[PDB]
Amino acid sequence: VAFGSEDIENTLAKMDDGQLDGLAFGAIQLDGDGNILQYNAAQGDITGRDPKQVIGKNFFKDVAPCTDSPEFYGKFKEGVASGNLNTMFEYTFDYQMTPTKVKVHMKKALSGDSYWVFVKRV
Ligand SMILES: *C(=O)/C=C/c1ccc(O)cc1
């Protein structure tokens, strides 16, 4: 499955604990509040987080405070409220990591109650 595919969430809805680690891009699944439900191996390779340790933490408050901004978290919240989260943008991640330019794709999951954040280096 390629980053930014039109129906990426269809493919990832099918994936368990293992298949998500084989993606070529970082993949985080969040609930509506930003709590981390899933976090794959490719994302940990970019950020220096242990995927097994971040589960349950809040992405915007605790893990990724540089994303607590209108440009990221504001766009996330707008999408969980509208029910149609689907946006791609560039961003820099720099909290307890080497400042790293990325491309982000946020997309509602098929559950309707969980939201994907996809990341790749640029
Ligand atoms: C800014 O503080 C970004 C930090 C960050 C982004 C994504 C992650 O999975 C971990 C940390």
Swiss-Prot record:
InterPro entries with a match to the protein in the record = PAS, PAS-like_dom_sf, PAS_fold, PYP
Posttranslational modification: The 4-hydroxycinnamic acid (p-coumaric acid) chromophore is covalently bound via a thioester linkage.
Its function? Answer: Photoactive blue light protein. Probably functions as a photoreceptor for a negative phototaxis response.
Molecular function (Gene Ontology), one example? identical protein binding
Which family, according to the similarity comment? Answer: Belongs to the photoactive yellow protein family.
What name does the UniProt record give this protein?
Photoactive yellow protein
Name its species. Answer: Halorhodospira halophila
Q: Which residue intervals define the domain PAS in the entry?
A: 20-83
Q: Which PROSITE patterns match?
A: PAS
The alphabetized UniProt keywords are: Chromophore, Photoreceptor protein, Receptor, Sensory transduction
Q: Transmembrane stretches, by residue range?
A: none
